Structures are given as structure tokens and as C-alpha cells.
Amino acid sequence: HEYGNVIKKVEEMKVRRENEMLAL
Amino acid sequence: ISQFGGVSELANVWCAYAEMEMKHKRAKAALTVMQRACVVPKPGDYENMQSVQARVHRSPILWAMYADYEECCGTVESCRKVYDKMIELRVASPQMIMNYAMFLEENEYFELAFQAYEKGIALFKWPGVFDIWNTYLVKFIK
Amino acid sequence: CTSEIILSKDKFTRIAILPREEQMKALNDEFQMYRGWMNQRAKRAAKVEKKLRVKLGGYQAIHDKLCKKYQEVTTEIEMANIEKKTFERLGEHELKAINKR
Amino acid sequence: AKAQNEHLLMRQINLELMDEYAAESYLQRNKVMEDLLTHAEKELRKTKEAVMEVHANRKM
Amino acid sequence: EQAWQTYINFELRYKEIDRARSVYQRFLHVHGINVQNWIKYAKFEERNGYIGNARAAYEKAMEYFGEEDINETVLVAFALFEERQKEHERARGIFKYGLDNLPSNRTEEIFKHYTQHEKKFGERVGIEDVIISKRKTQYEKMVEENGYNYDAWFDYLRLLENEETDREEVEDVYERAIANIPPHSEKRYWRRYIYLWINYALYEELVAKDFDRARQVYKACIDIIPHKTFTFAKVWIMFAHFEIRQLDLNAARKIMGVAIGKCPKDKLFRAYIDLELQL
Amino acid sequence: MSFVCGISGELTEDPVVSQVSGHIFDRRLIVKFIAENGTDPISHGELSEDQLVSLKSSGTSIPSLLKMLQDEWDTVMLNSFSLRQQLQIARQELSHSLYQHDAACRVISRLSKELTAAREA
Amino acid sequence: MSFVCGISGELTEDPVVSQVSGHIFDRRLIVKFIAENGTDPISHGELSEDQLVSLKSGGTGSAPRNVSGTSIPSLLKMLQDEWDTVMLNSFSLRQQLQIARQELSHSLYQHDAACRVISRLSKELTAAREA
Amino acid sequence: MSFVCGISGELTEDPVVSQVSGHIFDRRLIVKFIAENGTDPISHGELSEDQLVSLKSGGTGSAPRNVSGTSIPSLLKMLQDEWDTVMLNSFSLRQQLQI
Amino acid sequence: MSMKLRDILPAPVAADEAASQIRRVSKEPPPYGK
Numbered sequence A: 001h002e003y004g005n006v007i008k009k010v011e012e013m014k015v016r017r018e019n020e021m022l023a024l
Numbered sequence B: 001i002s003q004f005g006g007v008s009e010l011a012n013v014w015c016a017y018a019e020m021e022m023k024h025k026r027a028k029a030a031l032t033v034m035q036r037a038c039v040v041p042k043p044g045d046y047e048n049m050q051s052v053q054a055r056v057h058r059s060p061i062l063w064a065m066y067a068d069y070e071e072c073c074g075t076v077e078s079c080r081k082v083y084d085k086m087i088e089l090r091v092a093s094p095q096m097i098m099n100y101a102m103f104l105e106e107n108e109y110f111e112l113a114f115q116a117y118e119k120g121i122a123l124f125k126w127p128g129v130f131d132i133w134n135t136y137l138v139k140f141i142k
Numbered sequence C: 001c002t003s004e005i006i007l008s009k010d011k012f013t014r015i016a017i018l019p020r021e022e023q024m025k026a027l028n029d030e031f032q033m034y035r036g037w038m039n040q041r042a043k044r045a046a047k048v049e050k051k052l053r054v055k056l057g058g059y060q061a062i063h064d065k066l067c068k069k070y071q072e073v074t075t076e077i078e079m080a081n082i083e084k085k086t087f088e089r090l091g092e093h094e095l096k097a098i099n100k101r
Numbered sequence D: 001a002k003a004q005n006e007h008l009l010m011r012q013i014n015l016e017l018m019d020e021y022a023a024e025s026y027l028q029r030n031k032v033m034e035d036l037l038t039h040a041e042k043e044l045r046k047t048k049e050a051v052m053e054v055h056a057n058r059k060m
Numbered sequence E: 001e002q003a004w005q006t007y008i009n010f011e012l013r014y015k016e017i018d019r020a021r022s023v024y025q026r027f028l029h030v031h032g033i034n035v036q037n038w039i040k041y042a043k044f045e046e047r048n049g050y051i052g053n054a055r056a057a058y059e060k061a062m063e064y065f066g067e068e069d070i071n072e073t074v075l076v077a078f079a080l081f082e083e084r085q086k087e088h089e090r091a092r093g094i095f096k097y098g099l100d101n102l103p104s105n106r107t108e109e110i111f112k113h114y115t116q117h118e119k120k121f122g123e124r125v126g127i128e129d130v131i132i133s134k135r136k137t138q139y140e141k142m143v144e145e146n147g148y149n150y151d152a153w154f155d156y157l158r159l160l161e162n163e164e165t166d167r168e169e170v171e172d173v174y175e176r177a178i179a180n181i182p183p184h185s186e187k188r189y190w191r192r193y194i195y196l197w198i199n200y201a202l203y204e205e206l207v208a209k210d211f212d213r214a215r216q217v218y219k220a221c222i223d224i225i226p227h228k229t230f231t232f233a234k235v236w237i238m239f240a241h242f243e244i245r246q247l248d249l250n251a252a253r254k255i256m257g258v259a260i261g262k263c264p265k266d267k268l269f270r271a272y273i274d275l276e277l278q279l
Numbered sequence F: 001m002s003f004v005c006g007i008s009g010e011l012t013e014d015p016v017v018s019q020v021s022g023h024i025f026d027r028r029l030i031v032k033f034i035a036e037n038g039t040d041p042i043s044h045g046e047l048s049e050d051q052l053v054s055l056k057s058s059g060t061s062i063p064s065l066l067k068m069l070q071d072e073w074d075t076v077m078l079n080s081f082s083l084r085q086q087l088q089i090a091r092q093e094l095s096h097s098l099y100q101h102d103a104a105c106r107v108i109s110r111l112s113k114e115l116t117a118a119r120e121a
Numbered sequence G: 001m002s003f004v005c006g007i008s009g010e011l012t013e014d015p016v017v018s019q020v021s022g023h024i025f026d027r028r029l030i031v032k033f034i035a036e037n038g039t040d041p042i043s044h045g046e047l048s049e050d051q052l053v054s055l056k057s058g059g060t061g062s063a064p065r066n067v068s069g070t071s072i073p074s075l076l077k078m079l080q081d082e083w084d085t086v087m088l089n090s091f092s093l094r095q096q097l098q099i100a101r102q103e104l105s106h107s108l109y110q111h112d113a114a115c116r117v118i119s120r121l122s123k124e125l126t127a128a129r130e131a
Numbered sequence H: 001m002s003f004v005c006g007i008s009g010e011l012t013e014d015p016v017v018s019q020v021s022g023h024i025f026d027r028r029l030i031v032k033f034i035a036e037n038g039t040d041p042i043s044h045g046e047l048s049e050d051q052l053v054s055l056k057s058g059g060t061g062s063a064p065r066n067v068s069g070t071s072i073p074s075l076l077k078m079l080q081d082e083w084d085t086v087m088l089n090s091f092s093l094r095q096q097l098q099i
Numbered sequence I: 001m002s003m004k005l006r007d008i009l010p011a012p013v014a015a016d017e018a019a020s021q022i023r024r025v026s027k028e029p030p031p032y033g034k
């Protein structure tokens, strides 16, 4: 409820891991 | 540490080291030499990974010597580690795959003996597997 | 019972049976125990807090700078938008003046 | 003294969670705040030219 | 595709691994539909030791082709990769996930490789469990291929009985066996078939020990055999002796007397006479 | 009307009842309870946010309201501490009682074995 | 503008919200989607051009955006989130206390166990001392 | 998503838009404004509570705690100091309007 | 979307730095006037 922004941590971690990575 | 003309020359030196320690009854040192001889290099462990000392761990003569001392002086579990690593590295010949299974079978680890035969079959391509399958299928039935 | 029972003279007793001065000593030591528990926590809290202050202080200083910059810009937008609307209205008044002169 | 014991306990739990996530959330906060500043400076620059254009149409 | 390979090979001959990687990542944007291009990339990342990229490449492959329209070739390749990286609990995981989520008309590759992985790197209770599940699937297939492959039923029934599988499932498969009534009025074709019924009653009497259900099996034999064109004395004798057990000779006599009534046959007389002598 | 939340025991501005038990809750607590525990809080049956039925339906000084918060917050935290203190005391009574029970079983075991000897004196 | 379109994913300069969707679109996107498909991309409800309203900011009286991070709403919000946590914490503690307090009341055998020991030992004594 | 109310300038957890203006509001504020004045607060168009379209998209994320905001009494202290600055601001406005 | 293999599988236990963590001049003139 307070740190619900951790969804944005994993998303930006995921987006970062799309660098040097594949299609779709 | 010195240079040699080829892997087989160096492997004889490693064996000759453990050989003399075994005859002098330093069996734990002899195993230590073989452990120190057989340790697979990591990609940074040598100036180049194609030098003689960086390739000597692929020599089957060296692993044969190591596994034989573990059968004579080690625990059953330690022998499996040697043989399993020897299978992992493609080093094991079909004959010494059958030695591995003979060792487990002799120690009545029959079901692990079949896993030894099983990965023997995974490595080799016909006709090389033919005597692995022969010994496997008659032993399983027996 | 959880309010009536307090230790005194190194033993658990009823509170009401003790001499008055012994009740005061018991309640003093009971209070001093809680003050100990607080201080044991407060030191641990301050230790973590002191780490956070330096760990976060850079991010906070950046936010402080951005707030000042954002206030300056938005007040400039306000005054500029006032100037736009007067000069637009003044431009109409000057156009009438052209026809007059 | 009992009440302060729990405030300090909840403070510790808050601080420990804050140690996990404050650095990320403050970084995320700045990244949003930066966008507002650039977008505000975009609006500031856009309106300045429009005020200047009115001076142009007046002089012309 | 053959063009991009020559560009990859060009960069690899100069040992420009990160360049060759970038060609693959563009190559899959164009020819990504061919699963083999996706496996070749992960083999490339693996063979150069970028095992974290190889794993991510297979995980992205599953994501790309869709985790509802699951692809066996990725699962097998991915599972065999983790096996070869000694991530055997992940390798086992990938195989089991495949079998759990795909119809058994596919999965033959997943099965054979799973009963390779488990047959080496597993253990006896696991090795036999997967081989049984393979065999059950294999019999179930060759039954659907024919139905009248009675030897597939006799094996399948024996397998399920031997593995002590739950009564409802052994009983159900018998009902599917029984529906394969021979399309002939000639006893030759029934001689093999009829032991499906006999074994079903023997299972119900010996293993399930539910004699009321066993009676229903035997009764349903006699409603199926033509009797006018031919008879099996086997079933009448067994059903008579089944009612001598449970101490109901008044039923056994009724069963065996109707056998004489519908179809005088020498073994039926002999067996009834012998019963009355023993009584 | 006055409605009392089953979780907090406080008067609630948003009384809601669950069909799985018929106990009234503040919507906000029970949603957080469901989102954390999944069960009904009183009957322990499975519950979900769609199973919740909503019931039918001044200011004085900000320095005063801030002091009412301060005193009220200290009361909530005082309660939470006394619960943790009371819970450890209950566990200490419980574990002592089990020790007395287990010691009594050893005594009854000891004496009942010794009582067999009187049949062979 | 600060509005991000739900469908194109871009920060829009033509923000429009549709009454059935409760969602934000580009004008240039939603008009052709209505033209080609007549349908809300999100809810799959019907759409028509009268259901669309375009967003604006910075009108007369429009308050300055608070950026200081602190605010009265956000402090009252997190004070509320503290309160919910402490009550659900206190509720589970109260439940735990009830369970422990319940069973230790049921477990109050110990005086009756003592009478059984007295009964057993007195029998033992009379059985030990008869020879 | 993230939104700010035209009336208060704060983030809002319940963003709503009037049908008669482009501006967006926190629902309970605009409803209270309508309950007094029956009109759009910015366009001065006549407005009713049913002419409000609600953004079901997720409201603005919570403001991170200050390190001083990690304890309940220091939140109340922070709330007190925040409140005083808000009242001084409101008092400054009525002076500025007179000037 | 379906329950991912990202979620279902055990985390890899053979993690290693090189395996899965080693992923992937001129003069100027002097300034104006000087």
C-alpha cells in the first residue's frame, strides 16, 4: 500500500533488461 | 611448470609424481597430486587456454590414473565424483564407462550402475556405444 | 493481575501489600526498565536514520533545486501570460487609434 | 513509556522499509519532477515567442 | 535467412562476438517466426559462454511464441540446455511444465527427452514413474489407432493392475476395452476377446473384492455372447463357481441349468456334473 | 446510525457486511484484510471483495484536532503494546502449564510403574 | 502535455477523454477508431463523437501545482495507512491472545492431576506396606 | 497515471472532469464547489454533479516519506508545520487581493 | 498472460559471474584570439 511503486522498480528493471535483447 | 612437447609427455610426469608417492605410501598426497593435476582450468587461469598445461586435464591417461587411486583408496562417493566428472568432460572412453559401472555394481549400487551405462549411451555414437549397450542389456536382465 | 503484579525485593508480589516507599521504588524501577527499552530502540533507530540521511541527501538536494527552478519558471509563465493578454488587448486599442489619427 | 515503545517499533519498521525503497522512490520522484521542469520550460519558451510575435504585429 | 547467416559468419570469423550478437537480435526481428533461428541464437550465446543470455534467449522464445500456444521445440531445447548447464531441477521443471500444458498427441518429443533426462539424472522412483506414464500414453495412442488391438488392452490393463492404480481408473479402462465387441458371429474372433471380460471379473472379485460388481460383470458377459450361434463354456463355468463361492448353490444351479437350457455343450454338462459330485 | 467495525471495534463511517459471516466491517480494513489474508476475519471462510454488501447510511479547532490525534494515537499504540505484552504473558502461562502437565505425566508414569512392584513383593 | 495516451502510449498534445471509457486518448486516434470501428478500444462499449471531451490546464484561477512533496492530503493519507496497519496488526495480536488464553484455560487440569498423584501414591503406600 | 486538481493544486486519488470545461478536479472538492455555486469553477458555465466524467485510470502514486516522516508523532509535527504554512498562504492571498 | 516459466521454474542455482553476470585522440587549437 505504501511502497506499491516497486512495480515500477521491476518494470524499469525489465525495460533495462530489454537492452541488448530480442524482439517482442 | 616447465614446457613440454605435448600433453601426453606432461601427463606422464603427473602420473610419475603420484606413482612415486603411492609407492612411498603417501596415498593422500598421491590423490592430492591427481586432484591438482585434473582440476579443469577456468577461462582466466592461464596465459592462453591452448597451452600444454591448460589442456593436460583432457588427457584420459590422467583421469584413468586418478579414478583408479580413488577405487583403491577413496570412498565410493568420491569415486562417483571422479567418474562423473570424467563422463562430463567427454574424457571417459567406453571401456572406462564400463569400469565405472563395474565399480558401482561391485559395490552393489546397481541402480547407479545403470545411470553410468545410460550416460555412456548419451555420449557415444554407434558403433562406439555397441559394447555399452551389450553389457547394459544383459546386466539389466540378469 | 497484569497491573497488580510487580517485582519487589527481587521477588514477585502483589503491589498493594508493599510499604509505600517500596511501592515507589518498585514503580521507579518499573519505569526505568521501560526507559531502558525505549533507549535501546532509539539508538538503533538513530543508527539507521543517520545512514539514510547521507544515503538520500543527494537525491533530496536535487529535488530542492528542482522545486526552486520549477517555481521560478511557473511564475515567469504567469507574468508572461499576463503580458500576452494585455498586449493582445492593447494591440486592438492601438488599431483603433491608427484609424483615428 | 508504553506508547513511545510502539512508536519506536513502528519507526524502526518504517526506517527498515525506507532503507529498501527510499533510494528508488526518490530517484523515481526526481525523474517525474525533471519532466515537469522541462515541460514547463517548453511552455515558458512557447509563450515568450507569442508575446514577441504580438510586438512584431504591432510594429508592422 | 541464408543471407543473415553469412553476415553472422563474417563477424564471427573476425571474432566480433558482440557484433554477431547484434545481427541475431536483428535477425529474430525479421525471421523470428522460424523457431530454429531462435534456438540457433541461444546455442550461439551458450557456445560463447553467455549462459545468462542463452537462458534469457530461451525464456524470451517462450514469451514470443506465446505461453498458451506453447511450442514443444523451445521446451525441449530449453530443457536440454538447462540439463547441459546442470540446472537439472529446472530441466525437470521444463519437461513437466510441457507435459502439464500440452495435449498428448504432441509431447512425444518432450516425453522421450524427459525419459532421457530422468533416466540419467533422475532416480529409480522417478525413472519408473515417467516410463509408466509414457507407456500409458503409448497404449492409449495405439488403442485409438485401432480399438480392436486387444493385446494393447491386455498390456494396458496388466500395467494399470501391476502399478496398483486406483480402482475407478482400472474399472473405467475395462469398460472401454469391453466396447470393442468383435464384429463377427464366429467364435474364432471372440476367443481372444473374451478374456477381457474374464479378467475384468477376476479383477473385480480378487482385487477390488466387490462381489456384487463382479456379478454384474459375469452377467454382462452372458448378455453379449450370442449363445445361439456359439457359446463359451468358460464364462458359464466361472459364473457358476463364482456363485458356489459366496455359498449360493441355489444361484449356481440356476446359472448352470440355463447353460444346459440355452446351449447343451459337453464341457457344460461335464462341469455341472463334476460340481454336483463335489457337493 | 452507529455501526461498529468488527476489526477495529470503532464507530465506522462506511459500514459494510460480508455474506460469508454477517459481521459488519469498515470497508477499508476488510478490503485490506482480504487483500492480505483472503479469509473472512471472524468465520475464517474464503471471502472475496465482491461478496461485500454495503449497508445503508463538525470541526472545532485545528490545534485542538491535532491534539486529539496526538492523544488518540498514543492510545492506539498503548493498546498495541499491551497486547504484545499480554500475549507473551499468555504464552508464558501456557508453556508453564504444559511443563506442569508433562512433569505430572512423568510422575504418574513413574508411580504407575512402581505400583507394578507391589504385585510381586 | 503530461497526459499519456492509453492506446498510442505517447505523451499527447490533443488529450481527449471518452465518457464510456473513463480513459484518455489522442483526438487524432479516437476519431478514426470511431470511424473505422465505432467502439471503445478499452471497454469495447459503443462510442460516438458527442461522448468525447478534451482536457485543458492553466485556466484562470487554476491553482499552482504543489511540488514540495509534503501536503495535507498526503500526510492524512499516510496517517490513515498507519492506522489501518496498526489495527489489523492489533486484530491479529488479539486473535493470537484469544487462542493462547483459551487453551490455557482449558488446560487447567493441574490441581486434578495433583489429586490423582495423591490417590496413586496413597494406594502405592498401602500396596507397598502390607508385608 | 498522475493528475492534479485544478482547485487545490494537489495530486488527486479521484480525478474527475466536468463536461463543460477541460479542467480536472478532485471529486469531493468540485462537488462541494457545485453544492455552493452550481457552476464550473473556471469557465463559470452552469454545472451539475451528473455532468462529471470519471477517470477510472489509477491515481497519482503516494509521495515518498521524508526521513522525519517515519514516525507518527513526527508526522503530526510535520502536519502541524505544514498546516501553519497553508494557513499563512491563505491569509497572504486575502492581503494580496486587497492590495 | 499465462503463468510464466519466469515464475514457475526454480531460480538457477549454478549462477556464476562469467556465466550470467558478464552479459552485454587529437590536438585542439588554442581558443579565439588567444
Ligand SMILES: O=P(O)(O)O[C@H]1[C@H](OP(=O)(O)O)[C@@H](OP(=O)(O)O)[C@H](OP(=O)(O)O)[C@@H](OP(=O)(O)O)[C@H]1OP(=O)(O)O
Pocket (backbone or CB within 6 Å): E231, E232, E233, E234, E265, E266, E267
Ligand atoms: O465343447 P467341447 O466339445 O467339450 O470342447 C471344449 C470346448 O471347445 P469348443 O467350444 O471351442 O469347441 C472348450 O471351449 P469353450 O467352450 O470353453 O469356449 C475348450 O476350451 P478352450 O476354448 O479354452 O480350448 C475345451 O478345451 P479344454 O478341455 O482344454 O478346456 C473343450 O473341452 P474338451 O477338450 O473336454 O472337449
